[PDB]
Design a protein around this nucleic acid. Structure first.
Ligand SMILES: [Zn+2]
Lengths: 275, 377, 141, 142, 121
RNA sequence: CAAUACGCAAACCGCCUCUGCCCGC
């Protein structure tokens, strides 16, 4: 009921890998250009899975602010084959358990499912962020042309203990240092709660800079480092006049934890006057 | 903690499965040099062919095949390591170190596989009276592990590329439901999927040098040339356990390691403290075991007595860590005949079987230093 | 079960090579045998994802038979060595399953280089999809 | 909309036009991989569209072309069909020519149709201040 | 059986220029060619690199091909120099040649050799 | 006097579950 639209907060920037990355033994590449790239589903489905786990521990602190967290106890439906019950992860996809609130008004009240979207039986609430693919940057487009290898290979081994039987394989990783260019657009639909979802999306990004991005990750295959460039707002009046009436937020040398921390409320101050 | 820096106490070789042929090398001095064939070959054309494709494939009498660039040319090298030993008559294959841009780093898959050996050793010490209740749930083979009686006393007779550690990794880390065998490993059931180690910062060119590893245990010693990080280099690595990934899996982990964590307190809280107490009990025990054998070189014991009174966590890495340091079989010394029939089952000596020196015969030490010691803290 | 996989395969293999040309019989025989082809491939696993490169190779020039080209040389080259690359990349327990599927198509591919292009490859491509379709019906995909 | 003269020939030369992306779903607890495959257009392909606007009233076409360029300028920030929220859209209009096609065109056949200048302009640049200048000579014909 | 392989050595010496056959001979060569995988992947995957890409790399593609047989000595030059003797007589031609065309029939020959290598073993 | 004996990955997981022609003559 009552889908609305005030604007689209655009989060441009550049994903940096200080340590070498892997997606998936080749890293998948853009076919028309040959370059590897970080997809959309590996960056939206990774932030959701570092935010459904974060919400799982904290169902006492968010329940006073978010309704429809009282409808779940922090748990898992993996042993007990029940669809919607007290345990927090409710949808068996085919064999996996992903927290999706099964209604519009549950997902309207849910802190996860108002942002990363939610399916349902005759409800089907749709998302508010759209996360685009990340190709190489235009200064790193040219190292492919200059032959400076945008990728590499890696030979590991797997040691059987008794006979010391070496069982090697060849991982193929993106080389450490290669820099992509990501894109997240937040679809501002409800002016009552967008202070949350901008400080709530950066929550999922900040855990990702401590965690890994795709690949194995527990061995070195992560280390995202979000280099932001500029938030803009794109109001509804931007799409009628076509002006540069999009409020620029200055974050040329700031971190994901340096926006969500002190410094937030002065940056987004003109957007609040624009609501 | 984050960014727990390390230091290097002995030569340390992380292999990449690659050797430097003598057409890549020309040592003008006691220093050596790694020539750039792609640039040098394409730079020696201006003066002119098919002779380079004929001579490099021929491999004649190496010395002249690298000193023939000295005629009307010079100075084409890449890295220029140091020899640091009384060798190199080229006749060598320098095994090279893993490098990301020609810069040596330590891979995080190699420092995790050393912690995994230390953690596996601690699980088989403390866990036969409790090892049956782990496989009492959906395995039905603990009665064979109970009637034999500490699941190690069964596994010496259970065996009696190589998948020898398949059951023992499936007992200490991951009990599966069922298989054609009794049990198998499940990667989804593992506390070690919460252990995150990352690749270290790159070490530096100044700390990399060639070495001359002599093999001792036979009357005729053999040399192997290799490059390794010199002792005294210190880099920084960050290791942390994601405790949130253990709270979600409190009901899904099924292994003897999980039944070592529920006895020190909250099992998603003491796993990082269990982790280092497993390190300083596998690697100090293999440190003391090598003071028994005196077949090396004298000065080797003066390295081992100096490894004590050293703060931090001491562990092996790399290539010179022998069969004693990349294997449970330190714990399989006290069996004797229960492991003596099984060590010949797999076989060891070749070119029948080594009788009295079956496992521990080889020692690979560089310049009189037992190689592969890295101390975290 | 697997006892049907031993008898029905050895009943069919001498009938397989003795009709090596793909233009054997356009009547009810090539559909009646094709159910028996998937009948001893039922008890084996026979995963399709490795075959998806081969079938899309059969798909992308199936339009090109249809007024695209009159030459299936460049396509049928690519079908022969990749199907040898199927055991040539994937070995193991899926290799013993995929050796029995190798021995039916490899007699028929060598026809198709010198064959007609509008004919005798449609008679292969119809035998292609008869193997896949019943295989979904006996319980494999 | 069908592929441009160029991308017909990349189907003739041998370049692919559809890619098979494998996506997976994962349980938060047991890390249970739940995979699937998608056929999507290869990224960078290019289709030729054409949108005809039947001018019925000269009172309200300025405020009705602006609404079409508002729905297009949102579509460049949103996605065009498909899974979309995970990257699969991201479409971008490249304008070849605006043409007016007047009433005197259809009877006679004279090439007197008014052509606007939209060579290297974004969809937001038409609706930018200059919509009074891009379609200024359309006002002379009314 | 080495003479039947030497009978195939004339077939490797038959294809001096590039366009050997568009028919079954490139397979029938490669069946008898393939009648160690880990030593060749700096040409095998190096062929995969240069396909999408050039001329200065093909010298390195010829320099690495002689760098393989110049490394391994002893009993490890026999099938090495043999597999050396097939590829370069189809690569001495392809320096001054079309790149996207005229290489495919070797690029499909290079892949077909390793394909029957794993089937025969 | 210097090396060669051998290993290039095994597994499971392969789509899912919501909707399926109305309106006006
Ligand atoms: Zn929810």
């Amino acid at each position: 009921m009552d889908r609305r639209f005030y604007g689209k907060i655009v989060i441009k920037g550049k994903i940096k890998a200080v340590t070498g990355l892997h997606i998936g033994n080749p890293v998948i590449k853009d076919p028309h250009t040959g370059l590897p790239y970080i997809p959309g589903s590996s960056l939206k489905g990774r932030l959701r899975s570092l935010f459904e786990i974060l919400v799982n521990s904290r169902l006492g602190e968010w329940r006073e602010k978010y309704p429809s967290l009282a409808n779940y106890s922090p748990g898992s439906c993996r042993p007990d084959n029940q669809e919607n019950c007290g345990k927090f992860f409710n949808r068996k996809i085919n064999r996996g358990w992903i927290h999706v609130c099964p209604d519009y008004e549950t997902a309207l009240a849910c802190p996860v499912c108002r942002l990363f979207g939610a399916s349902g039986k005759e409800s089907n609430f749709p998302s508010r962020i759209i996360v685009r693919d990340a190709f190489l940057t235009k200064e790193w487009e040219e190292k492919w042309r200059a032959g400076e290898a945008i990728t590499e290979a890696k030979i590991e081994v797997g040691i059987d203990r008794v006979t010391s039987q070496a069982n090697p394989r060849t991982n193929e990783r993106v080389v450490a240092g290669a820099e992509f260019e990501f894109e997240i657009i937040y679809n501002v639909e409800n002016t009552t709660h967008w202070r949350d979802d901008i400080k709530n999306l950066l929550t999922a990004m900040a855990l990702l800079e401590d965690s890994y991005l795709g690949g194995s990750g527990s061995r070195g295959y992560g280390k995202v480092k979000f280099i932001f460039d500029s938030f803009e707002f794109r109001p509804l009046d931007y799409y009628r006049t076509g002006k540069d009436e999009d409020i620029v937020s200055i974050d040329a040398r700031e971190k994901s934890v340096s926006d969500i921390l002190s410094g937030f409320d002065s940056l987004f101050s003109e957007v609040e006057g624009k609501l | 903690m984050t960014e727990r820096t390390l230091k290097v106490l002995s030569p340390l070789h992380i292999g990449t499965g690659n050797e430097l042929t003598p057409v890549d090398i020309y040592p003008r001095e006691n220093i050596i040099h790694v020539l750039d064939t792609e640039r040098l070959v394409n730079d020696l054309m201006n003066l002119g062919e098919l002779n380079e494709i004929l001579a490099l494939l021929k491999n004649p009498p190496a010395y002249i095949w690298k000193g023939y660039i000295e005629e009307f040319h010079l100075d084409p090298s890449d890295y220029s390591i140091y020899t640091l030993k009384i060798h190199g008559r080229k006749s060598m294959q320098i095994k090279e170190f893993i490098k990301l841009n020609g810069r040596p780093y330590i891979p995080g898959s190699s420092l995790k596989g050393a912690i995994r050996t230390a953690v596996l050793y601690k699980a088989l010490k403390e866990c036969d009276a409790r090892a049956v209740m782990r496989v009492v749930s959906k395995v039905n083979g603990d009665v064979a592990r109970d009637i034999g009686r500490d699941v190690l006393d069964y596994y010496m007779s259970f065996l009696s590329r190589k998948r020898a550690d398949d059951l023992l990794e499936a007992i200490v880390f991951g009990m599966e439901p069922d298989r054609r065998s009794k049990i198998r490993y499940e990667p989804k059931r593992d506390p070690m999927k919460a252990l995150i180690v990352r690749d270290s910062k790159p070490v530096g060119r100044k700390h990399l040098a060639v070495y001359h590893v002599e093999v001792i245990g036979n009357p005729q010693p053999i040399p192997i040339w290799v490059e390794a990080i010199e002792p005294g280099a210190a880099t920084d690595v960050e290791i942390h356990v994601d405790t949130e990934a253990l709270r979600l899996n409190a009901d899904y982990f099924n292994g003897l390691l999980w039944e070592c964590l529920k006895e020190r307190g909250e099992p998603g809280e003491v796993f990082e403290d269990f982790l280092w107490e497993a390190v300083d009990e596998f690697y100090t025990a293999v440190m003391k075991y090598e003071t028994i054998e005196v077949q090396k070189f004298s000065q080797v014991r003066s390295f081992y007595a100096s490894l004590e009174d050293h703060s931090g966590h001491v562990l092996r890495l790399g290539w010179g860590s022998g069969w004693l340091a990349m294997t449970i079989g330190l714990l399989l010394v006290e069996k004797g005949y229960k492991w003596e029939n099984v060590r010949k089952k797999l076989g060891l000596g070749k070119k029948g079987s080594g009788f009295s020196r079956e496992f521990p015969k080889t020692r690979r030490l560089a310049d009189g230093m037992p190689m592969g010691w890295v101390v975290l803290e | 079960k697997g006892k049907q996989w031993e008898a029905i395969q050895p009943y069919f293999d001498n009938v397989v090579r003795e009709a090596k040309n793909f233009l054997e019989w356009s009547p009810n025989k090539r559909l009646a045998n094709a159910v028996t082809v998937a009948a001893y491939l039922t008890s084996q696993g026979l995963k399709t994802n490795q075959v998806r490169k081969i079938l899309d190779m059969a798909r992308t020039t199936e339009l090109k038979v249809k007024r695209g080209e009159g030459d299936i040389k460049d396509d049928l080259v690519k079908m022969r060595y990749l199907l040898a690359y199927t055991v040539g990349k994937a070995t193991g327990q899926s290799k013993y399953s995929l050796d029995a599927f190798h021995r039916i198509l490899d007699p028929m591919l060598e026809v198709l280089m010198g064959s007609p292009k509008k004919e005798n490859f449609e008679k292969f491509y119809d035998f292609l999809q008869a193997v896949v379709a019943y295989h979904k019906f006996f319980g494999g995909g």
